[PDB]
Design an enzyme around this catalytic site. Sequence first.
Site, PDB file in Angstrom:
ATOM      1  CG  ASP A  57      11.943   1.580  31.289  1.00 20.29           C
ATOM      2  OD1 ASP A  57      11.374   0.750  32.010  1.00 20.29           O
ATOM      3  OD2 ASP A  57      11.688   2.814  31.336  1.00 20.29           O
ATOM      4  CE  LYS A  76       9.300  -3.298  32.192  1.00 20.36           C
ATOM      5  NZ  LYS A  76      10.117  -2.195  31.589  1.00 20.36           N
ATOM      6  CG  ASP A  81      12.363   1.003  35.468  1.00 18.22           C
ATOM      7  OD1 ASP A  81      12.552   1.063  36.710  1.00 18.22           O
ATOM      8  OD2 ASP A  81      11.333   1.527  34.899  1.00 18.22           O
ATOM      9  CG  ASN A  82       9.966  -1.362  35.371  1.00 15.46           C
ATOM     10  OD1 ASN A  82      10.200  -0.890  34.252  1.00 15.46           O
ATOM     11  ND2 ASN A  82       9.319  -0.651  36.331  1.00 15.46           N
ATOM     12  CD  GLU A 124       7.197   3.540  36.707  1.00 15.67           C
ATOM     13  OE1 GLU A 124       8.089   3.096  37.451  1.00 15.67           O
ATOM     14  OE2 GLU A 124       6.957   3.041  35.577  1.00 15.67           O
TER      15      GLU A 124
END
Length: 213
Positions: free
Chosen positions: A139, A142, A167-168, A197
Amino acid sequence: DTKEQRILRYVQQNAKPGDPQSVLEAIDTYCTQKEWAMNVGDAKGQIMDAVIREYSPSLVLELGAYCGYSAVRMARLLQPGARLLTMEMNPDYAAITQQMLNFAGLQDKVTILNGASQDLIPQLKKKYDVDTLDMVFLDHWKDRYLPDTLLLEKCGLLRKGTVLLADNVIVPGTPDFLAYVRGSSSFECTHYSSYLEYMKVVDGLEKAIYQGP
Ligand SMILES: Cc1ncnc2c1ncn2[C@@H]1O[C@H](/C=C/CNC(=O)c2cc(-c3ccc(F)cc3)cc(O)c2O)[C@@H](O)[C@H]1O
Ligand SMILES: [Cl-]
Ligand SMILES: [Cl-]
Ligand SMILES: [Cl-]
Ligand SMILES: [Cl-]
Ligand SMILES: [Mg+2]
């Protein structure tokens, strides 16, 4: 002060010390009602909880703590004696995360390492007595997801069955990581569609289970 300090202050004034669930609720309320922040959030958080519960990992590595939301989320579900290591390169954020964990009463279960993951990952075996990791939550920046995955494997930190949870993978997105794990015979991948989120924006988590070389 900074957004992150405001979030910590809000938790301190709106949660019960030693009660992780109340800490998560307070952060989610703050970020929904006052100021958005890049915490994993409740929608993806629920998916994370379901994953943690399935694998009951004894040792988890988190890359990118931020304010400690995911560290609280994960650590609260760990079995007695299980441990979380979390890396955070921004000292201000590392301090927020430590304080958030202390407030939640989870400080004995989590170690928050203040440094860059590419510098700390190679020290895990010798300095922190890690053999292999049971789970890794990605996380952080990236563009570092793929390089740190490859570094973990070079370092001997992955074993058959090691769960990578990222994540993401939609927003901001991690196109090189996602393409790599999905194309590699060394990972079995699952996509969990969800929402960014605190936002009505599609996002998702990718689970990539390491299968060995
Ligand atoms: C090599 C290294 N080593 C150690 N710590 C490291 C590290 N690289 C970064 N960190 C740490 O991790 C966090 C930063 C995480 C990056 N996360 C995101 O940028 C992020 C962004 C969004 C987002 C989505 C829509 C938007 F419009 C704007 C932002 C949502 C998210 O969920 C994200 O996670 C931050 O605490 C940083 O210091
Ligand atoms: Cl988080
Ligand atoms: Cl990023
Ligand atoms: Cl796959
Ligand atoms: Cl949410
Ligand atoms: Mg994130």
